[PDB]
Amino acid sequence: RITLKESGPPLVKPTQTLTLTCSFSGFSLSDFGVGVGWIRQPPGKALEWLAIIYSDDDKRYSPSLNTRLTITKDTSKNQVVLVMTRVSPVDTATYFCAHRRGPTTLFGVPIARGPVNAMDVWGQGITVTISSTSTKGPSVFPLAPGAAAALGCLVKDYFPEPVTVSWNSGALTSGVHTFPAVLQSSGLYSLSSVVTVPSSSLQTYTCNVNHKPSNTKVDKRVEPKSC
Amino acid sequence: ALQLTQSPSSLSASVGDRITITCRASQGVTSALAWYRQKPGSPPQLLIYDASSLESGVPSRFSGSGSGTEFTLTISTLRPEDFATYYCQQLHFYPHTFGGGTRVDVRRTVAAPSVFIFPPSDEQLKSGTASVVCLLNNFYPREAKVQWKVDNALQSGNSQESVTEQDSKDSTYSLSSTLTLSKADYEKHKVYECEVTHQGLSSPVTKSFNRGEC
Amino acid sequence: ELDKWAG
Numbered sequence: 001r002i003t004l005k006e007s008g009p010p011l012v013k014p015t016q017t018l019t020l021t022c023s024f025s026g027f028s029l030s031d032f033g034v035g036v037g038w039i040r041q042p043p044g045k046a047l048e049w050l051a052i053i054y055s056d057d058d059k060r061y062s063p064s065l066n067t068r069l070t071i072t073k074d075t076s077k078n079q080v081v082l083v084m085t086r087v088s089p090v091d092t093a094t095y096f097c098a099h100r101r102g103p104t105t106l107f108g109v110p111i112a113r114g115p116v117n118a119m120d121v122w123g124q125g126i127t128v129t130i131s132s133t134s135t136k137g138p139s140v141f142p143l144a145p146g147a148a149a150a151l152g153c154l155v156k157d158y159f160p161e162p163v164t165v166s167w168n169s170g171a172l173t174s175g176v177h178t179f180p181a182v183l184q185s186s187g188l189y190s191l192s193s194v195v196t197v198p199s200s201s202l203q204t205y206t207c208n209v210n211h212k213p214s215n216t217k218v219d220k221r222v223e224p225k226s227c
Numbered sequence: 228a229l230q231l232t233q234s235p236s237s238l239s240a241s242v243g244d245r246i247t248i249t250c251r252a253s254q255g256v257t258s259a260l261a262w263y264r265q266k267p268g269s270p271p272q273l274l275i276y277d278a279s280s281l282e283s284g285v286p287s288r289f290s291g292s293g294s295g296t297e298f299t300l301t302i303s304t305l306r307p308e309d310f311a312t313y314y315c316q317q318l319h320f321y322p323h324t325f326g327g328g329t330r331v332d333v334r335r336t337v338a339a340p341s342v343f344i345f346p347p348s349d350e351q352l353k354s355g356t357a358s359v360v361c362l363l364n365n366f367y368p369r370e371a372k373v374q375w376k377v378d379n380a381l382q383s384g385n386s387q388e389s390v391t392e393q394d395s396k397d398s399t400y401s402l403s404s405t406l407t408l409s410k411a412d413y414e415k416h417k418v419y420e421c422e423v424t425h426q427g428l429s430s431p432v433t434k435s436f437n438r439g440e441c
Numbered sequence: 442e443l444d445k446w447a448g
Contacts, residue, residue, distance in 0.1 A: 119261070139354065143345040154351075321442055
C-alpha cells in the first residue's frame, strides 16, 4: 500500500519562499523508474501540473513556473521537496504530490511501459494561502430586501478562513445559503450568507457569525429597513 | 504548449445513466493519457491509465478508449458517487497537462433563478466602502451570467462571485455576486443594476435600485 | 519535449 502526505506552512506572505514536503511510504525513490510529481489546484479551478522527479534523479518543471521551482529528493528519508520562490496571491491553491509508477519489469527487465501513463496514488493535498494579511475579525453588515423574500449578512474583511454563520442560533436552516468566501485583492476574505422565506414571515432573523481565529462573535438582527 | 480540451465542460445526469466524457489533444499523445475522478474535498483518483487500462480496484462500469488526439471515458451505469468532476491528463509531452475538467451533476428540471439586489448598508458606507450584492437563488443548470451596470455603464474588474455546491434536496445552485466601490464613487451614481442571463429565463432579468431614493 | 518513458 502506497500512501503520500504533503506538509508545509498553511499561510505564506507574498515574495516569500514556500517549501512543501511530500513524505511517502510503500515505495522507495530508489525503485526502478519511479516518479513523484506535484500538482496544484487553486480554489474552484482545474488541476495544474508543476513538476516531477524520478529515482534516477531526472527533474522536469512546468515551463510557466520553471524559474520559481526547485524539486529535490531525499531518498533515505522517503521525501520529495518542492521549493517555490517569490510567491504571490495567485499561488494560493491546494498542493498535491503523487506517485508515478515506473515500467513493469520481469526478472529485472523492463517489459511494459503502459503503467507509467498516469499518476496512480495521490496525497490528500495541503491548502496554502498566500496573503500579507494579519489575523483580523469580520465587519458584519445587513443585507435587506415564488413570492419569496431574501435577506442576509455580508461578512466582510476577515482573515484567515474559516468563519461560521448560522441563523437564529441554529433554528433557522431551511432556505439558508452560506456561500464560499472569496479572497479579495486586499488579502482579506469576504462572504455572504442569505436566507429566503415566505414574503409573509417578515418572525425575526438574526445571523450568528463567529470567526474563531480573531475571537470575534457577532449576532446581527436583520430586518426589512424603512424604520 | 500542448492543449487538452475536455467536453462537455459540465454535464447533467441521473443515477443509472450512461455518460461519456471526451478529451481532445492539440497534437498526438499516443496512448499516454489518464482519467481521474475527483469528488469534492478529496484528491483526484485514478480510474484509467494508458488510455484504456482499468486501474486496479476501480469498478468495471468505467471504461476508457481512444489514442492519438481523441479519447473518451464512459461510465456505463452512473452511481451516486460518480457525481463529481472528471479530468484527463496527458503524459507524452512535458509539461504533463490536465484538461479543464468536466463537472457531472444531478439532473433536474430547468429552474430560473429568483434574483435580488441589495444596496450597501448605511453602516458600511460610514466606513467608506460600498458593497452591492446580487443574489441568484435556487437555479438550474449551473451556468449563469451576472452583469453589473451603474448608470448604464458596464462594470468590469470590480465584482466577485461564488456559487454554492448543488443542493442535496433541490439539485439547484445559488450564486452571490458582490460589486465593490469606494463610498465616493458610489455616491457619484444613481442606478445600480444586476443583469442576469440564464437558460430558464426567456430573456435577461434586471433587478435594480436608485441610490439614495427614500 | 518528450515524456521520459516515451521515445
